[PDB]
Amino acid sequence: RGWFDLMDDWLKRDRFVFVGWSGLLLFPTSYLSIGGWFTGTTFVTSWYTHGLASSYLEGCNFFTAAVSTPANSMGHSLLLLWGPEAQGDFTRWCQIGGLWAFCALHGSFGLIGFCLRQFEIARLVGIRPYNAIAFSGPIAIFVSVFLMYPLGQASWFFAPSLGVAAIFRFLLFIQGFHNFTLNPFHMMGVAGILGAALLCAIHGATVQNTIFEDGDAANTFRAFTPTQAEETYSMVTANRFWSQIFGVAFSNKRWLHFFMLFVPLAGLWTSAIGIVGLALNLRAYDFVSQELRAAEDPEFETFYTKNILLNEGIRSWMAAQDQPHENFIFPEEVLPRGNAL
Amino acid sequence: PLGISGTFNFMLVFQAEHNILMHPFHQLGVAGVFGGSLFSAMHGSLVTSSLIRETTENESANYGYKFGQEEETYNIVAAHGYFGRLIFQYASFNNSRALHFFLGLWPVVG
Amino acid sequence: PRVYDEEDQLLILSDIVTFEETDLGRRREAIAEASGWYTGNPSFGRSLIEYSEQTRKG
Amino acid sequence: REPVAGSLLYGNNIITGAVIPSSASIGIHFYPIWEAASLDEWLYNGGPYQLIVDH
Amino acid sequence: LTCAHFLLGFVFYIGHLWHAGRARAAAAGFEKGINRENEPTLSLRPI
Amino acid sequence: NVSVAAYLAVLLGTFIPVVFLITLFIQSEARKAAESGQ
Amino acid sequence: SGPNPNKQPVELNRTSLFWGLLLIFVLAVLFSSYFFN
């Protein structure tokens, strides 16, 4: 055979870890992204980009350590190590936040490689590729949040930083500046995630509580063997239970599993649409009728107006330290307060 | 409050007063719901991927399963092999009952 | 200047995987038949083409 | 003495509508309909919230 | 004290529910699963 | 105050998919009843 | 012209009908507040 055929044979060998053609893209990119995240959370500081200490060397713990986004002085630059910003200097590249761009780009290519890996393993095994279509959900989440949102904004600075407390900051910052809870696409995403968790729990409990008595032991995990031509749980009993308890029940296992697949994927894609909308500040921030009613009626108050006041407080009290490049200086008199209202 | 914006106000005030995001139990709950979504999607993908051909191309694959049938509608072995090749071989739920017990357990515990 | 792939590439395998029935399944079927689980709605769980084909010939 | 509207007929949509929790003056005191001087007083202090929550 | 014993009360309510349900199932005789020979829902008429 | 277009959008985007689904279901049931004994 | 061999019947289940009606009504409820603004 040819060289290509021999390489295909070697990459397809049944080893402990499958490599495949997609591995040539997945393994280096994912390995470099993970290693860069560890390096940033262990050694690299954020002092020259965010005015923050985010590293174990500076004294941070697992929650407060992060690979922070590049400085706002950089635009949407690729921040190549050899690029004009760093010019080959590793220290300056780390100080300007280039490690965040390294992690984000190599991680996006790692996600692409993992999706291709799912496709390739599905093709070789001989099954339908409903994986790498489920993973399109997380891929869309990553693309919309870590790539499309900063690209729509001023720079990479407003992307989420790769850390726990950094992610929490990003949540509160987006809530303050966009009112993302009020966004209907985010509502559909929340519904999808919570419904997927509900489906997982309810399906697990339903299967565990409708098993056939296929063993004499009280512990029933031994009663199942993979080479079974018979179903291990009663679908009829489960359908009767949920039809007389909830009013409706699944009767088709294939439809049930497709639904358990579809709900989180649809939720993630709707949330991705919402974040893409946020990328251009095209947000469902306010209801015009409610604002007009509150403006002409000081005694009119709803929880939406309280949320608007909370978002204004978040923005005003976090702008100075969250965006140090803007050099925001707000006197105490102009800072919103409940007593000030 | 028994509403949507009221719920958002409750969440924001709770985060302000108590810093629930830094609470390890809310982190466990977030892990529970995220894992529930991931595991529901994964289980659905593996079952739908390994559906045994019981239908023609002109109809939905869901009709390949008949309500009350005694045989299994999908190949557990094929899905197990695909999952054990997507990650290392050891990480795989060969037992269907144990897999469904874990599916029930994780989000409930979260 | 001075071979055909001959592969369909539009073909579903379309081979039905037959499953056999045992005595236990037959006993369950008889018990369900005695309770009317097979009468009532005959078109449930069947596609339009499947129901049409089964109604055309018995 | 600054009420908060959460009903559709008082200027709310589906998103902004809510059943407002009980009055802070009530605290966690049991507040059924018969423990209020008038039905208007019961509605003004968030009694339906307690009713819905308990049931 | 309040947080600890409230958590303990909740988890022991969970334990009571689990052990009471399993006691009922074991006394009735189907805590190991459905018999698959005389299935209770197969004798009940549909709907 | 509220726009004409807002009510029009809500009502039409509710009704048109609904009547499409109802028409499709009625057509399917008609095929089922015609093929089966009636 | 003539008889087209690619014609196929289209079927919608009652479950599918109810899923569709529920989806449309829920989307209408969700987006009505934003359309009315």
Binding site: - | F67 | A32, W37 | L9, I14 | - | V2 | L21, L22, F25
Partner: peptide
């Protein structure tokens, strides 16, 4: 006037739930 639309949508959703529960396709063994 929008309150009428909101109430109509909510009542329609509740009626759809009612018809899905009490007028579903009855499951049968095939």
């Amino acid at each position: 006037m929008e309150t009428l639309v909101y109430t109509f949508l909510l009542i329609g959703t509740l009626g759809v739930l009612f018809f899905a529960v009490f007028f579903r396709d009855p499951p049968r063994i095939a």
